[PDB]
Each structure stands twice: as C-alpha cells, then as structure tokens.
Write a protein that binds this DNA or RNA. Sequence first.
DNA 1: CATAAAGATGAGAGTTTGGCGATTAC
RNA 2: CUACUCUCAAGUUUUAGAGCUAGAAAUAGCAAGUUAAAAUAAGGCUAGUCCGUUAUCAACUUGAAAAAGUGGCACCGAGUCGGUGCU
DNA 3: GTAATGCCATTGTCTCATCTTTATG
Length: 1353
Amino acid sequence: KKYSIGLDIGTNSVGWAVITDEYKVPSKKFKVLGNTDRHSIKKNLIGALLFDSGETAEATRLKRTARRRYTRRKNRICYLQEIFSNEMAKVDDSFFHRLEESFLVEEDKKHERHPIFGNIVDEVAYHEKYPTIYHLRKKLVDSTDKADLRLIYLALAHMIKFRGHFLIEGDLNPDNSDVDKLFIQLVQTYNQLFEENPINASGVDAKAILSARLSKSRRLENLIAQLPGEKKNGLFGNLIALSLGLTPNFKSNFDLAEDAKLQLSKDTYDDDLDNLLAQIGDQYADLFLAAKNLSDAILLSDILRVNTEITKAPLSASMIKRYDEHHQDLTLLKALVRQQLPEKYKEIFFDQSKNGYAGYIDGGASQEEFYKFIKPILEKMDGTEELLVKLNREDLLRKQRTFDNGSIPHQIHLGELHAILRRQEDFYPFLKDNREKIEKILTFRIPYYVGPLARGNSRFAWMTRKSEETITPWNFEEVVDKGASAQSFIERMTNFDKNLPNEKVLPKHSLLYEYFTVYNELTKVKYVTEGMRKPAFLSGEQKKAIVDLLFKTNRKVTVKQLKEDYFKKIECFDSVEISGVEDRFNASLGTYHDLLKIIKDKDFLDNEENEDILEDIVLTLTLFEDREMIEERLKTYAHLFDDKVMKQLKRRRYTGWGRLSRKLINGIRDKQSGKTILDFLKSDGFANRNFMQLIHDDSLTFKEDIQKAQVSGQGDSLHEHIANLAGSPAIKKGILQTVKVVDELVKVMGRHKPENIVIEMAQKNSRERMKRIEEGIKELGSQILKEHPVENTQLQNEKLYLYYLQNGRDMYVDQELDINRLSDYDVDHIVPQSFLKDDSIDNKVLTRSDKNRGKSDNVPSEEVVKKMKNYWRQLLNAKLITQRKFDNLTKAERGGLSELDKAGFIKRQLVETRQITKHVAQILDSRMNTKYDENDKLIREVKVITLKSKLVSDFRKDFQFYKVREINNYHHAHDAYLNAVVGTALIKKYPKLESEFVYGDYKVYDVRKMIAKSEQEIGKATAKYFFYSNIMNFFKTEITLANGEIRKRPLIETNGETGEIVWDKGRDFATVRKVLSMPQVNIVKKTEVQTGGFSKESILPKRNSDKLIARKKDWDPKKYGGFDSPTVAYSVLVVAKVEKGKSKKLKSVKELLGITIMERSSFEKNPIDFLEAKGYKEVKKDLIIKLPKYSLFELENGRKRMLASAGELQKGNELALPSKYVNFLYLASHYEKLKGSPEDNEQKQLFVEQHKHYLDEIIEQISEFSKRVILADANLDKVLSAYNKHRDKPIREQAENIIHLFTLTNLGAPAAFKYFDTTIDRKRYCSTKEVLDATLIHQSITGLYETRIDLSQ
DNA sequence: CATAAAGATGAGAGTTTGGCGATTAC
RNA sequence: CUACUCUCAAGUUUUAGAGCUAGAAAUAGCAAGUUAAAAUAAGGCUAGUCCGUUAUCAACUUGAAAAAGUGGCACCGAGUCGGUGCU
DNA sequence: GTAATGCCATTGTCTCATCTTTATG
C-alpha cells in the first residue's frame, strides 16, 4: 500500500529502510534463484549497503606525471645519443649498445661486461683516476687537453639526465649571485643611504662567517662579534637576521607603536615591507632587495661551498671536496676505532643488518639512521672531536647523491655543460655545430600551458599543432601553436561557479572580488553613538566614505582606526561601539594597493572604464606562471605604461581562485528592483542583506534566476549529474549507490513510487579553549589559574570549563563559586530546551540553582539582567563569551524572545545548509517525478525530504534509542528507519513547512501562520502550529520548562487542519523499538573487482622463489629481482585436472585461482589458454565462476564468510545484539558525560547499577556468537580470561572495553584490539578451501533479491 | 632575578589488511 | 573543491668499479666502501617526446558494446528470519 | 609433503615536549 523510504547516505555505507503509514517496516517473501533446495526467504525491508570508500584521483595523477617524466627523460637521452651517434661510430662501435645493456648479466649480455671501454684495464684506470663522475666533470670543465668522446658523452648525459630544478628563471652569474659581491653591494647601498655615522667593514670575512656550517643564531652572533660598532639589535644586525631566516623585530629600531615582524619565507612579506616602507619611505627598498638577494646568495652559497675561484665548476668541485672529506673522516674513523675500540668493528663495517657503515653504504640505512647509530660510539670514544661537530651539522661521511640535491638549480648544470662544450669545441666539430642543440636539450622544459604533446589520442591533452612532424626541443617554437594552446589551457583550467554554471569564476585576488567581500563584511557592521541608543545599519554614503577613506588607504583596517579616523574625523563622534566585527576586518583590498604601488596612478585605479583592463591583467597573472607567456599576454597594454612599471608588473604573481563569477556578482539583475548583488550590498535601505541572504530570500528574483539556470548546466545522464556535484569522489559513489538502492526498492514494491523519500547526509579543540581561558584571564586580571592550576586535559569537563569561562563567578548571583562542590551546582540553559535544542557551551551557564533565572519560561528576567549587565559586558569584551551568548543573556531587556527569534530557531533546526544535500534531493526528485499535466506544470508525486542529523540524534537521545556504532553495521539501517519516521511525522504534522524540507517550488508561508501568540492560544481553530519554538516537542509526553512547571501534551498527536493522527505515543514508540530490535537487517557488502597498482612497488633482490614477478619481459627474476605481493583483481573458481607425480596422472581438482590485476586482460582475452598455461587441463569452461572481492558464502549454522582474496576470507556475519544491551552499553560508557538533567542522570545511574549483570550477559552473548560463527577459540579464551581478570574495575571501563571487544565479532576483515592493556591479535582465515563446498550467495544491491548456488559439484 | 615567547633537537607516528616466508603440527 | 598541467631529488634493483694474504677446504687477518649505466608499474597500438593505478561492476537472458528486461498479496510471530491463509 | 599460525607496505609529512636564549618589568 502507501509507503515511504528513509535514506542515510555516507562515504562508506548507505542505510535504507521502507516504512508504512503506521511506522512499520514490511517483511516480505522473496524468490531465491539457483540450484539449491531453498526457493523462498522472508526478509525485512530494512538494510544498509556497505562498500569501500571511493578514492581521489591524486595518486593516479602523480603516477601519470611520473611516467611522463621518465619517458621524456629517456627521450632526452635518446636525443643526445642521436647527436653523438655518427661520430661515436668512428671511435667505438658498441659503446651505446653496451650502455643500454648495462643491466643484463654477462650470460644474457651479448657484448663485453665492461660498459665504458669494454676492457678491464681501462675500466680500473678510469675508476682510479675518477672515483666519482664529478671528478670527470671537473676535469672536463678545467682541462684544455683533448678528452675521449665517450667520457664527454658520460659527463653531458649525467648533466642532462639529472638536470636540476626550474624554480629560478633566467641567467645566473656571480655578479648578482655570489655572497661577496652582494655583501659589498649591500654595505655600499647602506653607506650611500646614510653617510653620517656610517659603518665601515673591511676586515670582516663575510663568506667565512655566513657560509659556515652552523646554526643561524650562532652565525648571526659570530658576525656581530666581528663588528664592534654594530650590535644585534641594530639595523644592520636585524637585516642580517632577516637574511638568515630568523624573525627580527624592528620596533626598537624605529620606536613604532605597532609590532612589525618580517619573515622572508612568509608569503606576505612584500606587502608587509610595503607597509614598513610606507612609514620610512621607499629609499630603503633597494636595500631590503639586496638583503633578499643576499638571502638567496646564502642558499646558493650552501650549494656553492667551493666557490674559491680556482675552478670553473662550483658543484663538481664541491662534490670532490665532499669526497675528499668523506675519505679523510672515514680513514680517521677506522683508525680511531681500531686503536681504541677493537671490539664491535664488524658491527660497524661488516654486519650491515643493524645500520652500520656497511648498512649506510650497502644496506637500507639512511643518513639520519647511520648518525643515530654512530652517535653513542663517537661519544664514548676519546679523540672524537671534529667528527661530532660534523655529525651535529649533518655533514659527516656524506654521499654525493643525497636528498639535499633537490635544491640545486639547473643553471649550474647548464653552466658546466656550456663549459665542457666550450673546452672541447675545436677538437670535435660536431660539438661546434650542435652546441645550442645540446644546451636546448638540457634547458628545454614543456610549459604548463602546452601540456602533453599528444596528437588526438590523449584524454588529458589539448595543444594545437602547426605542422605534422615529431616535436623536438629545437622545433617546439615553430610547431606548437602557443596561442591556441594557451587558449585551450584557459578554457580547461577555468572552473565554473557552483551557484551559476556556464560562467567562469573570478580569481581570488580580483579587484571586483575584493570589493565584493569587503562590502559583504562591512555591511554586517553596526555602530552605536552617544544618544540614539539603538543599532543602525550603515547607509550607502557611509559605506562609500569608509571604503574610500580607509580600505583604499591601508591594507588592514582595525576598529580603533575606524573609530579614530572616520567617526571622530567626519562624524565628530567621540565614543563609538561596534559589534559586527571583532579586532579588525578580515577582508582587504590587497590588489588595489599592489597595483597602486606598481603604476602609481590612484585616479586610474578608480576609473570605471578601466575595470575590464585591470581584471584582465589580474586574470593573466593568476592563470599563468611563465615569464614569456605573461610577456606575450601583456604586450597589448604596452602603450598605457612601459619599461619600468610594466617590468615590475610582470614580476608580480597571484595564486588562487574564488567561488563566485562575474555574472553573479554584477551581472544578473533583479527584475523589480533593477539592482545587482553588489548594488544591493552598497545600498539596501534600512535592513542590509548579505550575499547568502539574497540567495535565500525569496522576495527577490536572484533565487529564481539561480534555480532556473541550474538545469541548463546539468546533463541528461545520471553519471553527468553525479559528476557535476561539488564533493569528494567517495560521497559521489555513495550518492550513486543511494540512487540505485532507491531504484531497486521501488522495483521491489511493484513499481509503486513512494510518497516520501527522507534523506540524511551522514587535541586541537582543548588547546584552543585553554588558550581562550588564558587570554580571558590575562585580559581580566583574576589569577584563578594561580590558585587553581589546570591543564587542557582536565578542561573537557563541562562544569569546570564553564567555571573558568565565567571568571569563577556565578552568572546570576554576585557570589564566588565553590571549586570543589560542582555536583551540587546546576547547569542552566540560557534559552530553554522547550524552545530550541541547543546543548552546546554557547547556550549553557553554571549556577548554584536555576531558580535564580526567575519565574518566566523565557530568557532570564530583567531583574537579573539589569544587575549583571556590567559583568556580562566585561565578559563580552574579554572574549570569555561570544556575541550570540551575550545577546541571549540580555534578551529580556529588549522585551524577551520574539517571533523573529522563534522563526530563526525553526529555520536553524529545519533547513539544511549543505549544498550537496540539496543537489542529491534534486537528482532523486528529477528521477522520481517525471509526469506532467495539460499545462507546463511539473507533477510532484514523490516528495524528497531533507533532514538534519541533529534531529534523529536528539530523537535517539531523548527516547533511549541509543546508537553504538561498534556493535554491528545495523545502525546505518536503523538511522535510515528513524529518518523515515521523523520525516513522515514532520510532513504529517506541519504540511505548510514543506518549503523548508521538501525539495521544489513551494509556498512562501511566513511566521504569521505558524508561530502562536501565547501558550493558552495554541490556535487549533486558527492553524497556529506551536507556541514553543522546538519542532520536536510533539514526540515528548511531558515538557519541562526552565522553571520546573511540567507542561502536558495529548497522548495522541493529530494534525490540526485535516484531523489525521500523526503520532500515537504508546503504539508508535513500541513499534519503533520493535523495529530497532529486529535481528534480520539486510547488510550487503558491495562486491567489487579490485583495481589499481599491480603489486607492492618494492623492487626486491633476486631470490629462488616463483612468487617473484619480472620487471621486464626478459628479466628472469631469479637473476634480476623484481616485485612480489600482487593484488588479486578477482578470484576464479576452476574445476579441471592437474598433473600429479612423476607419472603425471591426471587428478580432478576444484580450487580458487587468484587472477592478479596484471593478469586480468590476458585471462579475459582467452581464459582457457591462460589456465592451460597455469597447468590446468580439461577445464570445465561453462562452470567457471567470477568471484570478486567480498563475495559471500554461507557454510553451516548461519555462519558466513566474505572473499578477501584467493587465499583468505573475512568475517561475514552480524551480531544482532538485543536493544537492552545496546542501551546499557551506551549508558555505562557515558557515565561521567551523561549531559542531561540531574533527575534524568540519577535514573540512568540507578539503571546502570541495578543492571550491572548485563556486563556478564553481553560477554556470554559474544562468547556464544563467536563459538557459533567466528571460531577463534584462542582469542575467545584470551577475552574471557581478561574479563575475569578485570571484573573488579569500574562499570564504565568494563563497558568501554566490551566496546573494544566487538571488533572480534564485527563484519569484515579481522583486526587487532585491546581489552584494557591486553592486546588481542587478529585471527585470520588463511584458507579458502572450505568455501569451495559452501553455498555462494549473489546479492542484489538491497540484498532482497538473491541467487544461492551450492558449489558442491 | 623572574617570567614569557620563539626556535631548535630529537620523539614518535604517518591506516588497513592482504602477501609471503618462517614456523609448527600431523 | 574536486579535477589538471609541467618538473625535480632521493629510494630500490641487476652489472661495472679486478679484492690482497694464508689454509685441502671450512674459516681467519686486512685492503677498499662515497660513483656510474639501465629500469622504475608487465606493457598497449593509435606509434604520440601518447596511453597504462580515478570513476564504473550481484545473478540470469539477448547483444562486440552503450543498454534493455527477470523475482505474488495479507496475518501471527522474531537469533540473522520462521510459520499459516489467499493467489 | 600438506595445511594452519610475524613482518612488511616508495617518498620529499606531520606535531609535541624540553631546553636555551632574549626581552621586559
């Protein structure tokens, strides 16, 4: 008959339930297909689908880019060999061939085993002459003699293969990069800028001091020690500290009132420097620029350590020096160890298993592990100086190829490559002919805006070709259409506004965007002067004046500057108070002041004709990062300014994107008003509506415009609708599964669509509240922390946290609270629970008795507000409480609670803020409702109700339908059922509130029809729904107000307008409890083929094991190593015969074979050939069964297993624990944190104590379940033993640990768990043999329709 | 001389659950 | 708030970096250790300086595929669902 | 010879606690 569907959408589960009109879940008989003797099963229409989380595409993206990088590097090497080929053929015929075959063993190698020269003599000579490649490189850079072409290729190939990073753009040279020249330039600029009492620095050795390997502070102090005239707090000292990476404070150098901190690494240094420079002038700009340059020099100096000018290749010389120091330190270490500590020498240099030196060189031991291993050895021995200062500086026995080399720019390798090519240029003519070619190979980098160089067969590529020839680094400029490629790049990278599709989102640093957010924050500001005594919103002229005078003059505008430089200067207001914002305005016009610094034309920035130009420049600087394409895209504006500010503009870069588009902010226009969003922000009369309020408010056309355009952006298929959503792929997967669940459920119900579909979308904090308490105490001045010290761990208690939040004072009475008598003290709600269900700290106060609030059922009376307003104002301005809490505390002074407040509460409880939920409701509504009439009106047969989780949660807490997620997976289905119940109750009780929850166009009924005037005038004869603003009151039998008066509600709740019973407080709660108590809930684990990586990525050494997998076709893993541990895509049941014994007699077998992900395509191409290659004969082709992961098997006594693999199983059963034990567990574990009234808490406490034997009964229940199903008797014995060991412990702790015990019985993969301090390790099901003779159960998405196959055959 | 703030040197972790080799038992 | 481009440096793995002295070996004393090539999902055809780890997937029928179809209703109960009447 | 019972996992990231140094009253 009539029914409704409840849904609980999550990221790992989708709960679903079908309910009738009497809130009952139907139980139906379903047909069972297959070849067994079971043809029917009785199932309840309630369940939950389980599935693995959807994964994000990040890992795939990284892997893809890595593959591209490897490919392109190999192609670079192929280019180099292509240039060297013809001339190498005359010198050596099989050089490159030997290099290519370097990996093969001598047996499989067709050429000589020696790569470079082919004979052992020249190899030994080469390695002894050059023990590292940097020796050969340094020779080829510093030797004029002719060198062998093979070694030249080795150097060039090493510099090209590992070419270095590309973060620094352009040429690099010592004139603008070395520390010496930049230090001289810095002190020259310094002395030039002052010249009166200047600093003279001639004896100092800036290189030796700054480049030395020591801590930053010690280098600073050593340089100050080298300058007797300067001090650490001086200007030069603060500049050096800034250049080294410290956080210097410039207040003492200029006596500034506000602290100005500078950090070069911080992204906001430039504008901070611009503020600083604005105070002292722009003459010091180049000084700080040189400081920045000096900082870069120091970083460059950390790599360029051997920059002594003797060599021309700084890097290779530095690696040589590192080699030499390594050799010296090594020999010294061996000498010292052999002399002083003969024992354990083998452990350091021979063992290699415990991270010794042999582990550092030959084993898998990092540099930090080797240092950690040898630090106590060096500390114990004598004569270990110099090695330890090198160890602490992380420069002891370093290798030449380490993790630090990522900092090496590619200009260095380019320099060495140019040097080598120039030295051997005349000796080899083809180096003269192909110098720029090789240089281009090293320097060429594919731009971001070009992307993959495809030819139509790449899903990710977009570039356009101006020819039909192989793209090389040399002809890239004349084959790649950079213009069209950049245009396509723009079109792809521009995301569309979620509110309005088909319109590009503006950059995050767009001028119009910053104006929008600045006005959006400014419009919510209220000011009170001396006389009006009522809050007044800012007028249009006031907003424009404030913006122009403050926001267009300073990057940061604070409330003090606002009252001092506007209200006092223009409005002549001495004292002003502002509530809208806190310390300062979060929004700012950063881009405005940036462009003002660039072009120095304030009037040009305010011309409304130049808006599009500036927006285009900002868009260009946001989209691109390459200097050349920026130069190309800024040539049109060359006539506006040129050669200074254009250059400075090209160096400026912006990053980020906004959420709104231009057409939304200043495009679409209200038909009646004729004002855009920004126009409404600037001027809106008395009341000022913010952006979110204009979208919400139905009196304007903006909501209609956003709604009518929503269906234009979307597509026709379900996949496109889900792909367009704004969420993680996991919740999108859950949404698709939800849609399919709905489809299957309406199929099960004879293709009858439901009436309703209810949808629910399923240490730092302690530190923040602790800091809040400390800041409030420091601001106030009451040293409660001195007399009563507390830590962040103890502050989780509600009454103690409120005690410290309220300055250790009673909120209603002028007396101090007793620190050690909080149990006698009560926690009161500022706004009663009868009006709004808010149990947060934002709406709670602590007092000795809640009778001091007075006799009213509203906010606390005026007699207390008038007395405590001063103390509440001190707690307000001290950030002890928030603005909303102060507003609620002082509501009686402004009449008390009002109709607007109650409507705000209703909207807070009933409306869903999450956009994804509205889009899911839209998808289900579009799929369910598709009929029309004669007119162009949509017939809405199915109502899609959107509920908040708080409603169902409070429903559980109020009527003891407690949720314990750790027991089983039934709670998803139960949540779905309760969602259905609450949704149907609300739609039956309040039809006029359909527009709040039900999706679609609906009436706009306001507060007048709903909110009643008074308690006695409930209004049953006038349609008024409720006097008390809490929507969930009709479920309750009694309503306890804040005074203690117990209001009574009828036993049967009925709708006022239609006279339909909506809730029977006896029969319906009994029905709900019975439904939650049902043990047969359809839990289905979505069977999924496994995809992704073939195996573990580890490349293991060679081994005599057939589990190893070849890394290349002809790389036999017994000789070469490879991978192991492949992932099984799915398992395959094979019934065939295998050869047994010497005589190879054919024996019939039935077994599971794991088809790995790598094997999948080959197996599916021809299964029989694959199986015969595996050894199977006479395979029964028609009996092959594909068994993906989580395939379900039943064996005996209802015991179930899920397939994890071809050789392993998971638990397949659910423990249907009775409701009374679930509620007992919830209550026992929530002993101290009940968070309820004292009487209620006492009832729960006495229930726990009177029912403490449920602990033993739950243990018994787990035991019998495990013996029937789990069959892990070692762990069960462990559990029972531990439980007997800890029967003395408190009830709460035993409850908490039984909660941990339910992982033994949970559905899915076995997992380890802890009972108190005893760890119980997982018992695995390491054989799939038994399920080859069990019943396989193929399940529908809902688990209702099934087919059972008896694999005995 | 005492208290508060910032930076540096080690501390662990950074899921889960399937594969594989050693181990143990019949 | 997902998706995307370009790119670096390590790691790991086989070979090249001859090991020297005794001893029938087993095993002992020492000398050196820092680097390089190649691969970095097997591979694929569309042969690109492209693609290969995301999404998607119970069973059965028809199809190469996108995709269409296939499973009676009440009542009394509730240990993973059972029983009875109707049809 | 066959069937049932601890370690490892490609990454360049985190955050917390204690000690030392500098600044202010």
